[PDB]
Amino acid sequence: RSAMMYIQELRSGLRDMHLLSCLESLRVSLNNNPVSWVQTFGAEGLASLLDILKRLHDEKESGNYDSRNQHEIIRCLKAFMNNKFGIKTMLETEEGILLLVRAMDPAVPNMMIDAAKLLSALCILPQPEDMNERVLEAMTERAEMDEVERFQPLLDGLKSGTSIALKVGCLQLINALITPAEELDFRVHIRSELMRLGLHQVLQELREIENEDMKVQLCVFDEQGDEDFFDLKGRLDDIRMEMDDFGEVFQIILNTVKDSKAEPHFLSILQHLLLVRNDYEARPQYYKLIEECVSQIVLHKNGTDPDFKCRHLQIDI
Amino acid sequence: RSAMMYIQELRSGLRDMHLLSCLESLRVSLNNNPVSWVQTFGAEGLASLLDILKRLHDEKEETSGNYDSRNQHEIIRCLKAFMNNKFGIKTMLETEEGILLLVRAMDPAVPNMMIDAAKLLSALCILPQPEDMNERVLEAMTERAEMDEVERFQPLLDGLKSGTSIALKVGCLQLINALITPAEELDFRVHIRSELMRLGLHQVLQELREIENEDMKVQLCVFDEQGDEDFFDLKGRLDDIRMEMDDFGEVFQIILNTVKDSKAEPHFLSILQHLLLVRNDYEARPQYYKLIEECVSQIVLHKNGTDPDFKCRHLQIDI
Amino acid sequence: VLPFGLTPKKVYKPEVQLRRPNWSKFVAEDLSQDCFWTKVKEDRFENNELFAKLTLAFSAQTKVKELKVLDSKTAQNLSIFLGSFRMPYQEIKNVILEVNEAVLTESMIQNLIKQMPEPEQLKMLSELKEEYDDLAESEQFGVVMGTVPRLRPRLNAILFKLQFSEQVENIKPEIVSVTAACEELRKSENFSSLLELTLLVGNYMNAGSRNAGAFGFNISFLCKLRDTKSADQKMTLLHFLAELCENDHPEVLKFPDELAHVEKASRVSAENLQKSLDQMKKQIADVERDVQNFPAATDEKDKFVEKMTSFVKDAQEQYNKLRMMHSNMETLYKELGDYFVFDPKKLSVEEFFMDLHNFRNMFLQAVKENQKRRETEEKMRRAKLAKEKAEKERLEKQQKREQLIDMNAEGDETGVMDSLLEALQSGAAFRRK
Amino acid sequence: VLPFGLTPKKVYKPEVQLRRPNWSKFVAEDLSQDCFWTKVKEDRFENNELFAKLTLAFSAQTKVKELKVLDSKTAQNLSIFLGSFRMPYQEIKNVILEVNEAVLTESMIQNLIKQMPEPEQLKMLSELKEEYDDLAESEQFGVVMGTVPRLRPRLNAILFKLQFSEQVENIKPEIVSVTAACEELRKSENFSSLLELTLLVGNYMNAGSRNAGAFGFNISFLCKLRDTKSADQKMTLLHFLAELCENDHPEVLKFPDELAHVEKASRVSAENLQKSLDQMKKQIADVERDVQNFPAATDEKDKFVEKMTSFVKDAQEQYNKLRMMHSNMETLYKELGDYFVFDPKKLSVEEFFMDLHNFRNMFLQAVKENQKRRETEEKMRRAKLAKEKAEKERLEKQQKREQLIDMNAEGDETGVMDSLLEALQSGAAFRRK
């Protein structure tokens, strides 16, 4: 119909509020025409939307008002992807998921909200294969061109000054990245990266908020970490069954530690084990408390690594 | 001179006040008279003192009020005056119950006797000859504890508790030190200091640091000193292990040999199993082993030369 | 019949036939009165459904056409062969004549040679052409193969062709190995440095004997070095030489690494290489002479003479490159023979390099043994010093405590106890050091 | 004089003589122009002050009287023997006649026997008794020993005596070991039960042929049990039996402990106990004859007739206890033959208790092979259950995320995203388990 007119409008090089007025009515057309109409705008039309965005994202200097333009593109993208074609079409662009990630600027909350909301929906898709890993891959790509932490944007959207809805959308993406992932190591690896960046002190603040959408997300993040602990508890039982021979287990530890920075430490541990003083009654209790301490460090609940910066440990009963 | 007659006076079986006036003049003799006089008193009169002492001890068929524990304290003063010379020391040690009955004399309920009794044992402990002296004193305390069904250090602990007196608080810590400091092998000094902590010394010790007594600070400072020596020696024994045991297979065998057929076997196996859970991340896995190591080094190479408390939980890390 | 004082053992009827022990059985009248096997009429003493658990583990379950020429053996062999090959007899012929490289295999040609009737029979079958239909399976193959000219040589040539690019990869790697080790031994001045070092030590030891002032020694003697040891049988000459290189000439210890291809040379065959090439040369000239006597191709399908002319130029091109490498390798070994002065004809290549390999390993052995012995000297020196350290300090403690009570032949003093408590209670009676 | 373009190697003169490598050297002119050993006119390229160190390790440092009777064979040997003995000749004689128990040992006597000149030469020496001082050391000994009546017999009896209690402790333990094992193997009803169990299981497998319904089998066959195995070749009859015991009859597992002495009897030679008792009886009968044929003790010191009769009484007493046990032992073996039905004449006692000992060890080995193998089963069955359970839970979680969106092919409508975003908000996208 009039779809080609929009493409010709976008490729013509409009600016400021002209570019805005057009994109606004394009969002309307996208949201109100049949699915038929979106397909004719198609890969061609999306490509230009993304080109315009790629131009805008290249910002060098208080701030640009063209965040209205950026956010309005994100809005078209939602409308475009509001039907099965749009999604599969966006997943095919080389820079679509990346440009969304770049639009997660905590300094413009409402855009990040809408962007992180799309990225979350992509994450929990069945096809193609490992969607979450692609979304994560893109976050890493953005993190290297900026020289920051790939999760800094997300954590920043969670800190106390930020709006309550940004906080939800943020933790929503967190769960979108963790939950669909199948391998235990990968879930714990990512969660431990979040804690490393400072997620723990934040979640404390977040639980006290009585917002329904928020409470739901914290429930999911809790549930997804409680699962991992169970699977780890399970993994431990598999070990306790297969590894019942002193020589065999000890060989496996050497085989995994050999030629890694972890090697000197293991010898150091064993050298200490010689020190447990020679006394009939005190010795087995040293080995129990040692076992207690190693049990706590290894089988850390919440499905996270222990904080390796934390310099004090309680080792209970 | 007149020593042979003090022996007869003891065996005629004097009681109540008549015995006390006998022992009080005997003490006066044993102090002011020369060395030669006490030798002809010697083993005979001493084993009488220790038999009347043994008699009065088995008068414990009533508490909350005794009639003749004033006699007991006089014998202790006699034994002090007796042991004031080198022969008496030598002769005392030869008796089968001379030391043991000096230990049954230690009672927190009646302060003054325990001060003098624990002061004699504290002297015996720091003796060069013969050999393992402090250990004999310990054996007596153990022997006493057996027949009473109580913990062997319990009286020493009860005497330290703030309810008593300042002279007794010191006198008990003095014997604590006197039992620990002469002992040469580490595994013993620690083994005993750990028995003191389990009985709850650490709680009590932090109350005695409040008291502004000089004779008290001396004993705390000496106790603290000897406790630091032990840590230092344990740290040196750690260095010897680091330089002699550097093969994995050899070290693991040694532990295995030490742990075989005990109750620490199940625990050592479990430690190794748990090590197989330290996540398979290139970066986290070293940090796992470092933290584990770091924790262990605080459990085993524990400060002040005592076992960690096995009924509690908690641990900090450097520097 | 009624047996010797007891009643018959029940007849079982099994479902599955099981595997059985074949013991020497005892029947009724083998026993005696008081023997063990009479008391055990107790077959009931143990009875279950294990009979069903046992049968589980131990079950053992799962016209026309006459001959005219061929002998009973050959015709039979072909009958099993042709009921497996399944290719048409006209097609078999065509694959041979064309030498079709997509169809032919090493596996395929080899089987033809074995299963083939021999020239005399093929000739005798070639005269029955007209009655082809009345013949048997095997003889049909026979007549068809009969028309192929010079089949025995033709097949022998096809086989060698398909087999050629294999035996190239058997000779070359072995040639290269020996070539390299020869160059490796010659180049290494660290091994050279050991021989010098060994001779110097050697010349001094021979004092004024039948040896001494030797300008060298045979290189095989290197393994004999270990044989000469110290008076105390605790260290050898080889151990000495290693340790003297460990301390004063570290460069030397790098030679077992300089000799990488020596092991692979220790495993080759001098004679079998010559055998293999001489067997190849004859096999090239076999086809070369078989391509000269061949009759001119009388159909459009005979691609032998064309294709095998491409092979012989190609095969001789590769053989001559091998013949080069080989005689070069032998030159290099003759070269080592003169450089280190040893008879290259009375000691084979594998012989030499095995001795050299053995010595190489003997040498590392000596080095490991030395670091191991030396570590046991360091951990025994310090350990005895850590004992002399404690014993001196233990006597230092005793000499401080005895300075209060003197035990030898004393007199009198009633102080003592007063002197004990004056320090005990004042804290001095607890030394530092 | 003068070699091929070079100078002779320095002539050394060491202090201490050293052990040396005896190698085939190369003299001046074994070398050619371009050889390696010509380049090494160096000899300095590796010079130190190691000669000290080398010498240290390989240093190899640290008329009267004529013979009248005896040959120089015996007259020389005695000179050495008497050099080690140092005992007065007139005392040795007295210790022999008295049989002085405190001075005499098995070693001492055994030397005398060996060193003594034969009775012919002792006689010829006791005819020269007067001229005692003119004789040599060796012959002086002889003149003393010549006056001892019947020496060769006297000394033999003394030896057998000093050797008697020692050789009883060679027969006895072994007589007991075979007695015990014969009685343990007779007492063991756990062993018994194994046979009963084996027979049944065997009787069933033997189906309907040669052996079947057999009343017994030969105890020998016990080791051959391991030789019957499953068709899949995974496990043996022994194993099955062992497993049958392990589960259904745990009592049977105790039979290796009931046969305590069975090992010790596997090692005792049956033929050597027979020889030993036959020798002991002989040696007794020897001293018996000696005592009867002895002259009257014509001096106060000759205690031989006295002490040897006191030894024959005792040596015969202990021997009859020994024989009783042996004949008892042999009975109990023949008893076993009759009981378990086997020819005791064709299998020696060691041979029989070896087969038995071996079987014990096969059974105990089969028992741990059953445990280890069964342990492999339970772990591998738990590991696959936990993996089925993990995979089941995993699929359930997958489907719960797929009930969101049909990425399949259905008609295009505009819910999709607004439908995903709602499930994100409510938590429906993050289903649990």
Numbering used by the authors:
A (entry chain A): 134 to 194, 197 to 452
B (entry chain D): 134 to 452
C (entry chain H), D (entry chain E): 745 to 806, 828 to 1198
Publication text:
Formin proteins direct the nucleation and assembly of linear actin filaments in a variety of cellular processes using their conserved formin homology 2 (FH2) domain. Diaphanous-related formins (DRFs) are effectors of Rho-family GTPases, and in the absence of Rho activation they are maintained in an inactive state by intramolecular interactions between their regulatory N-terminal region and a C-terminal segment referred to as the DAD domain. The mammalian DRF Dia1 is important for stress fiber assembly and cell migration.
We crystallized and determined the structure of an “N+C” complex containing the N-terminal DID and DD domains (DID-DD) bound to the C-terminal FH2-DAD construct. The structure was refined to a crystallographic R-value of 23.7% (Rfree = 29.6%) using data extending to 3.2 Å resolution. As we discuss more fully below, we cannot unambiguously determine the pairing of C-terminal FH2 domain fragments into dimers. The tetramer has approximate 222 point symmetry, and is composed of two symmetrically interlocked N+C dimers, as illustrated in Figure 1B. The tetramer effectively consists of four layers; two FH2 dimers form the two central layers, while the N-terminal dimers pack on either side to form the two outer layers. This interlocked structure is held together primarily, if not entirely, by the interactions of the DID domains of each N-terminal dimer with the DAD domains emanating from the more distal FH2 dimer. The interactions of the DAD domain with the DID are essentially the same as previously described for structures containing the isolated DAD segment, but additional interactions are observed for the basic C-terminal portion of the DAD.
